[PDB]
Design a binder for this molecule. Structure first.
Ligand SMILES: Nc1ncnc2c1ncn2[C@@H]1O[C@H](COP(=O)(O)OP(=O)(O)OP(=O)(O)O)[C@@H](O)[C@H]1O
Ligand SMILES: Nc1ncnc2c1ncn2[C@@H]1O[C@H](COP(=O)(O)OP(=O)(O)O)[C@@H](O)[C@H]1O
Ligand SMILES: [Mg+2]
Lengths: 752, 187
């Protein structure tokens, strides 16, 4: 019942907006049973209320084709109401409307440029002649006529705001021309419906701000003071400032904007006086809303601040919020990236009473954000927004906006070829043909990366599941590790068990441990963070452990995310190794990771994968189920596997049919995966050597090798050698034996 | 959560960082039990390896109770399996009592792994089954016994017998110096 406030409810006044048939800018049509329900007569003047606090007046008529639940209204009033077809409006009778005494109108520049004749005679008088048009202060209405229609705005009325344009009502159009920029900016103002995925957060913010202002009698009856401070926190791009703008636009209360840095002043006492002036102005126009952005910069902790100016600024803000003189009807909103950096005294009651967490949207939230951002763009029928929403695993609202913008830019880049790119004008046909398609969104998805993880980005060599030869059972567990919890979450809820998200790769060098991680980076539908082992460690005392939390929090923020620790033995050690180990910092890095993988915090869809050459030196606590659940042995490839490895390496290469890969696999009894790749790499170099030597001969006489041949492999083999010795293998075969001999050595079967 | 990190033996590493690690132990020492009056603040810590713990931290008045949480016996292994599956629909025919007897050195985390792996095998069949239905059109209500059977063959005990003995050795030293074993007042 937290979002019981959002439910628009079923009301007679709420009318679905639909197109009009014969109505002009001052009349609307309704169904006769609806007038019988609302007790309206044909010809009554009415109030129509739109989003972002817009209002209109028209004349209500009867339409026999009108659905009872819909209202007919033309494009002019729809733009006046900031309402599109399918939305809802509120309708109520408009009494006591008097004939206008004087109305002031002004044209729109983009509709009037090139029109030099008398605007009044050509446009206004025929439009208003004997019509008695009801208009409001601020209406935007279109008048046809002459060479081009000229758009008009009402700026002043007598009386205000509602009048009937009678024949005697003097109409004048002299004044300063209106700028197109103001009209377009008003159109593109942000509303509540612009927010996406913050339904719970929007519920909370609405309860704090909108409800007390609209219905003070309720809080007076229950006899409590509603919360007067809201703190919005979360990762960047979640919509904190956007929610601020939406609240500012959709409230009939004074809004003041404060930016943490811009309040500062070198001269002593002027920043405190700036804060005092802002709060004095807000109290002057009470009720008022104050938004302080980047509150961390203005208001850090007083205890850990050496600057006197910063401490006194925090104290001044603290006193303004909850001093002796309680602020009457001022709601202070604040937004910050790091709520912990804020002075704890500010996070009290009476000062930012209810902190609101703007989080990363889920699959449904990102679909809503995509629909919001793509409404202004033209989409082909093939475009699927559900698929794109499902693909953007770690994306935040700003990331989704960047994705939409990148798809739009790619559409123009596709239309690049036709135009010369330097013509004075572009031909109208190619402009009309330009439209975004699904392939543009797919390209943007390939290019787009979450803003949170722009640091942990590495270019990967584009390895696909086919490029890995053998390891079929190792592969199958690897799709199922990531796909099952993300693609079928409901199944785990059904059977009631959490997924197992830990995997460790151990084996002899060069057998495919790193290559599998490259495959996961591309094929798996989840964010990928690649971590080298010693990259976390830092010479400072607390930095090495802090970097561990930063990496794990990035994965939690952008879940589902695969956290791959290459050479995990560098990070993870048996603990208690040497007296001098950088002061025990490596021993202390272990204890920080053990809490991140499995600690007193809720589990997220973070998949920790680690590859190590020597796995016996790993801390036993790391190998525990719940941290690294599965221990997969990546052994030296067998003759069946070696057959596939040769195919995978030479698939792109043109190789003669005379060569058989089966004989290659049979001869190499103990070669690793890298050894077989070096054999194929050596074959090209000899083929390269022969090919260039041939062309130089052919060029010399003036002044061949289409495919890799059998004698190249025979020549390349004699340089090849086995990378991993038997004594190295026995170490790895020994560790797997301990795991098998521990349990599962005897097949386990239930009794009949 | 990991008390051996913040509270380690002093003097083990000479020149450890700036010496800050040893001074933090001193700060914890005074805060837990010092000249100030003690409120109702209960300090609870967990550590994998308690041998590196500073003996001062272990002194009564600071973590006075040293609770040893050993590997579950057979009776606990039944409870651990039931506790994991209390919200999980399982077949009646599967007997959790047998599973406890087969596993001997399995941890509570290891037992959950068998149950979790059993769930993933069932989910694999359910996905494949619903794929087959789509092919013919154009399943697994509860966890079955064969799902646990295939899960167990991948299972393995995480704590080695050597890793156990480092804990019995620490536990025994407490009991070795605990006194004359059982204690009865004269008469
Ligand atoms: N199964 C395989 N299929 C295809 N290529 C393979 C396979 N195994 C190894 N390779 C080749 O081995 C090389 C590197 O292997 P990879 O990086 O996966 O090994 P690693 O054992 O994880 O690494 P390292 O031991 O060198 O730290 C690449 O040339 C890759 O093509
Ligand atoms: N929930 C959302 N719905 C619609 N658009 C969003 C949402 N969240 C973010 N955006 C888009 O991303 C941008 C977010 O930037 P903003 O939230 O102002 O940054 P910050 O959170 O650091 O103040 C906005 O310009 C908006 O267009
Ligand atoms: Mg490697």
């Amino acid at each position: 019942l937290s979002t019981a406030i959002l439910k628009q409810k079923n009301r007679p006044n709420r009318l679905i907006v639909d197109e009009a048939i014969n109505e002009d800018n001052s009349v609307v049509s309704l169904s006769q049973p609806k007038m019988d329900e609302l007790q309206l007569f044909r010809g009554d003047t009415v109030l129509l209320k739109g989003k972002k606090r817009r209002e209109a007046v028209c004349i209500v008529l009867s339409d026999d084709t009108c659905s009872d639940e819909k209202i007919r209204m033309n494009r002019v009033v729809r733009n006046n109401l900031r309402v599109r077809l399918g939305d809802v409006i509120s309708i109520q009778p408009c009494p006591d409307v008097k004939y206008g005494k004087r109305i002031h109108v002004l044209p729109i520049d983009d509709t009037v440029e090139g029109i030099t004749g008398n605007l009044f005679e050509v446009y206004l008088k025929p439009y208003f002649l004997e019509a008695y048009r009801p208009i409001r202060k601020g209406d935007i209405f279109l008048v046809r006529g002459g060479m081009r229609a000229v758009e008009f705005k009402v700026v002043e009325t007598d009386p205000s705001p509602y009048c009937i344009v009678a024949p005697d009502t003097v109409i004048h159009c002299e004044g300063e021309p209106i700028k197109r920029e103001d009209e377009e900016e008003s159109l593109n103002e942000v509303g509540y419906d612009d927010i996406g995925g913050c339904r719970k957060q929007l519920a909370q913010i609405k309860e704090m701000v909108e409800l007390p202002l609209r219905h003070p009698a309720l809080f007076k009856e229950i006899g409590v003071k509603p919360p007067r401070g809201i703190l919005l926190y979360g990762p960047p791009g979640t919509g904190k400032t956007l929610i601020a703008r939406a609240v500012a636009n959709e409230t009939g209360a004074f809004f003041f904007l404060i930016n943490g840095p811009e309040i500062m002043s070198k001269l002593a006492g002027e920043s405190e006086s700036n804060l005092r002036k802002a709060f004095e102005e807000a109290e002057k126009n009470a009720p008022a809303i104050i938004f302080i952005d980047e509150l961390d910069a203005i208001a850090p902790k007083r205890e850990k601040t050496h600057g006197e100016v910063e401490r006194r600024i925090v104290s001044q803000l603290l006193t303004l919020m909850d001093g002796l003189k309680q602020r009457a009807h001022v709601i202070v909103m604040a937004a910050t990236n790091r709520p912990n950096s804020i002075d704890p005294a500010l996070r009290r009651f009476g000062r930012f009473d209810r902190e609101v967490d703007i989080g990363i949207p889920d699959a449904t939230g990102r679909l809503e954000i995509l629909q919001i951002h793509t409404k202004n763009m033209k989409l082909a029928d093939d475009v699927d927004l559900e698929q794109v929403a499902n693909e953007t695993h770690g994306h935040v609202g700003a990331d989704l906006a960047a994705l939409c913008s990148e798809a739009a830019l790619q559409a123009i880049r596709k239309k690049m070829d036709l135009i010369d790119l330097e013509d004075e004008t572009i031909d109208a046909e190619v402009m009309n043909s330009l439209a975004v398609t699904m392939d543009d969104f797919r390209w943007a998805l390939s290019q787009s990366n979450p803003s949170a993880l722009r640091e942990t980005v590495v270019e990967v060599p584009q390895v696909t599941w086919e490029d890995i030869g053998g390891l079929e059972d190792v592969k199958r567990e690897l799709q199922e590790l990531v796909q099952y919890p993300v693609e079928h979450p409901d199944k785990f809820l059904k059977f009631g068990m959490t997924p197992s998200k830990g995997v460790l790769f151990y084996g002899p060098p060069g057998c495919g441990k790193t290559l599998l991680a490259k495959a996961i980076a591309n094929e798996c539908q989840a964010n990928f963070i690649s971590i080298k082992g010693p990259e976390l460690l830092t010479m400072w005392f607390g930095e090495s452990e802090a970097n561990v939390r930063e990496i794990f929090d990035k994965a939690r923020q952008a879940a589902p995310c695969v956290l791959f620790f290459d050479q995990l033995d560098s990070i993870a050690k048996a603990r208690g190794g040497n007296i001098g180990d950088g002061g025990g910092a490596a021993d202390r890095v272990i204890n920080q990771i053990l809490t991140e993988m499995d600690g007193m915090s809720t589990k997220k869809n973070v998949f920790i994968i680690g590859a190590t050459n020597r796995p016996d030196i790993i801390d036993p606590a790391i190998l525990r189920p719940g941290r690294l659940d599965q221990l997969i042995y990546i052994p030296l490839p067998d003759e069946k596997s070696r057959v596939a490895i040769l195919k995978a390496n030479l698939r792109k290469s043109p190789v003669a049919k005379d060569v058989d890969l089966e004989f290659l696999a049979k001869m190499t009894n103990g070669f690793s995966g890298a050894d077989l790749t070096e054999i194929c790499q050596r074959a090209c170099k000899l083929a390269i050597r022969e090919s260039i030597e041939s062309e130089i001969r052919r060029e010399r006489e003036r002044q061949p090798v289409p495919e890799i041949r059998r004698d190249h492999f025979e020549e390349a083999m004699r340089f090849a050698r086995r990378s991993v010795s038997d004594n190295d293998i026995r170490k790895y075969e020994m560790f797997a034996q301990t795991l098998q001999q521990s349990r599962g050595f005897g097949s386990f079967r239930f009794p009949s």
